[PDB]
Amino acid sequence: NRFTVAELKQLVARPDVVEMHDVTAQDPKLLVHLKATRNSVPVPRHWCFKRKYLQGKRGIEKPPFELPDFIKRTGIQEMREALQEKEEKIDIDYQKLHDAFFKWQTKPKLTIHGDLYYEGKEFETRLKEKKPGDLSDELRISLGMPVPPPWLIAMQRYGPPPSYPNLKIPGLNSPLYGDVFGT
């Protein structure tokens, strides 16, 4: 009465989204069509868990919260800390707070419509895929080269990398400005 997962994956045009719990549904064809939509979002990962999505962060004691630059550039945090130290007033300004709230307003980092909150969502700070020919600033500092990164001197001798065959890096077969020395 219930089809197997291989028969459901062979019949579906997009078999990279089928799960093991979708065979126990009442209509796998409609679920497979709805799961393969263009702008659809998946369900949360707490459907099979037993921690109720809030009991996993028991021993994690990180920073409770961080204030923005528009609030830190007003001097209210230091005055509040001085008042808390005196209790355990300021009257700095009235137009500077309005200027920090209107003119010096910083747009926060929002998220995508499909960017749902994961369980941990703090130890997986993934970011695109900084590949061959493109590096971050600081690691430039450790490397200490003034404005090729010097092991692309040895990418001369030993050859183009097996891992990224399509590679071009400056000065060799790739005829470079700022950070990015290969594409």
Binding site: A6, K9, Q10, D16
Partner: protein, 60 residues
């Protein structure tokens, strides 16, 4: 049989051949299969393919 994202859960080898045949670059490969610009009458008579027009240009 080269593997793929849809053929990850395949176990039998008989289904894998059909999966590799259907996955076979979807169904396109046709950028210039008609462009030939046949002179002849140049109005309603110029039914030729890309390779046919290439052979007609190489011959004359």
């Amino acid at each position: 049989i080269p593997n793929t994202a849809h053929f990850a859960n395949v176990t039998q080898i008989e289904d894998a051949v059909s999966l590799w045949a259907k996955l076979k670059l979807q169904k396109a490969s046709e950028r210039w299969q008609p462009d030939t610009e046949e002179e002849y009458e140049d109005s309603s008579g110029n039914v030729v393919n890309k390779k046919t027009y290439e052979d007609l240009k190489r011959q004359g």
